[PDB]
Design a protein around this nucleic acid. Structure first.
Ligand code: DCP
Ligand code: CA
Ligand code: CA
Length: 341
DNA sequence: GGGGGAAGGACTA
DNA sequence: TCAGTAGTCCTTCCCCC
């Protein structure tokens, strides 16, 4: 198999640059303003001029401003990036019917039946980059290898605005030399459990007793890592279908007062129903983020679709279940719909 | 023994 | 006054065949 992975460069910030070119060359920071106070919230992403200085996705907006007080701070306009993303995905469909859209800014193409070798895949990759640049003026990074995991890794190594092929020989070198923390799906917590087992490279998972590996990181991740280490990882490129749609909002102030929380919960339901658009969910979950940032949730599944009115009344019962079963105050409240008809 | 669901947890956004 | 904001898949514990 030959997989071609496309990951758009600093996506949210780049789309803003495309819509307002005077922004180019300046540090741009796209933010999610929570509304609790002046500048409360987090950075969604920043272009490379801002990232060079430590302003990156996830940090508080107040911290970003301490580092770069004169950078351009823009409010996230998700719907705008979504429309731009959808047009780029449509361009990629022209290069392969076998495409897997993994997120708002990334897709995997199985080009096995389109090119004969890596030389040709690499060329098709250039063709793709040029096409996206021509049509939307957006630069992307392309990663090419024998499977999804290594195609993604290839891209990670070449961004931004890059293109890289990890051939079979390099795949073998990487299995031995690549820091296992850099493997998709290995976060800080798993990375720490592995370091604690002596495991720092994929190749290391082949010599550890399987039960020891599994007992520590679970059966699924152990098999995943082993399959990659044996160079036998095979997952087909598959059309993704959204399985849930939801919205969670931050409250002006923490609380466990039902009438005070209702307005935020109802606003989350409205926005959520706006996004479902024709999709009818049979399940609804109320999700609360507690004062200490823990996540607690309660849901219900119906043998039929959930009308907006039913979503309103059931969400309150589920919220009450959360209040009655957890004594912490709530900071964020939202809903999540799933099991679509 | 293991299918199947609810809720927590990890990961990547 | 650090802490957003969406969404997926796996795990653990429980019911049930
Ligand atoms: N914690 C995060 C991480 C990402 N995103 C959003 C904004 C990013 O623009 C977009 C894509 O994610 P990437 O990790 O690919 O980040 P970028 O495209 O921004 O940059 P790059 O790919 O250059 O590294 O997803 C977000 O809202 N919150
Ligand atoms: Ca990406
Ligand atoms: Ca990207």
């Amino acid at each position: 198999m030959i997989v071609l992975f496309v990951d758009f460069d600093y996506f949210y910030a780049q789309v803003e640059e495309v819509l307002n070119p005077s922004l180019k060359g300046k540090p741009v920071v796209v933010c999610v303003f929570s509304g609790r106070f002046e500048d409360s919230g987090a950075v969604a992403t920043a272009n490379y001029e801002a990232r060079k200085f430590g302003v990156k996705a996830g940090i508080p907006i107040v911290e970003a401003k301490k580092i770069l007080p004169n950078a351009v701070y823009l409010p996230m306009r998700k719907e705008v990036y979504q429309q731009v993303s959808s047009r780029i995905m449509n361009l990629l469909r022209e290069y392969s019917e076998k495409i897997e859209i993994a997120s708002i800014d990334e897709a995997y193409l199985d080009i096995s039946d389109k090119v004969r070798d890596y030389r040709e895949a690499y060329n098709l990759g250039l063709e793709i980059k040029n096409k996206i640049l021509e049509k939307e003026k957006i630069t992307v990074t392309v990663g090419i290898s024998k499977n999804k995991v290594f195609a993604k890794i290839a891209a990670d190594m070449a961004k931004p605005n890059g293109i890289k092929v990890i051939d079979d020989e390099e795949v073998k070198r990487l299995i031995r030399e690549l820091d296992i923390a850099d493997v998709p799906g290995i976060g800080n917590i798993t990375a720490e459990k592995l370091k604690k087992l002596g495991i720092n490279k994929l190749v290391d998972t082949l010599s550890i007793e399987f039960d020891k590996l599994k007992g520590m990181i679970g059966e699924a991740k152990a098999k995943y890592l082993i399959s990659l280490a044996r160079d036998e990882y095979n997952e087909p490129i598959r059309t993704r279908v959204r399985k849930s749609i939801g919205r969670i909002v931050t409250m002006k102030r923490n609380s466990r007062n039902l009438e005070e929380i209702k307005p935020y919960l109802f606003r989350a339901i409205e926005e959520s129903y706006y996004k479902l658009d024709k999709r009818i969910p049979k399940a609804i979950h109320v999700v609360a983020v507690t004062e200490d940032l823990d996540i607690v949730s309660r849901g219900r599944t119906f043998p039929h679709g959930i009308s907006k009115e039913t979503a309103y009344s059931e969400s309150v019962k589920l919220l009450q279940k959360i209040l009655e079963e957890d004594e912490r105050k709530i900071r964020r409240i939202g809903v999540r719909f799933s099991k679509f008809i």
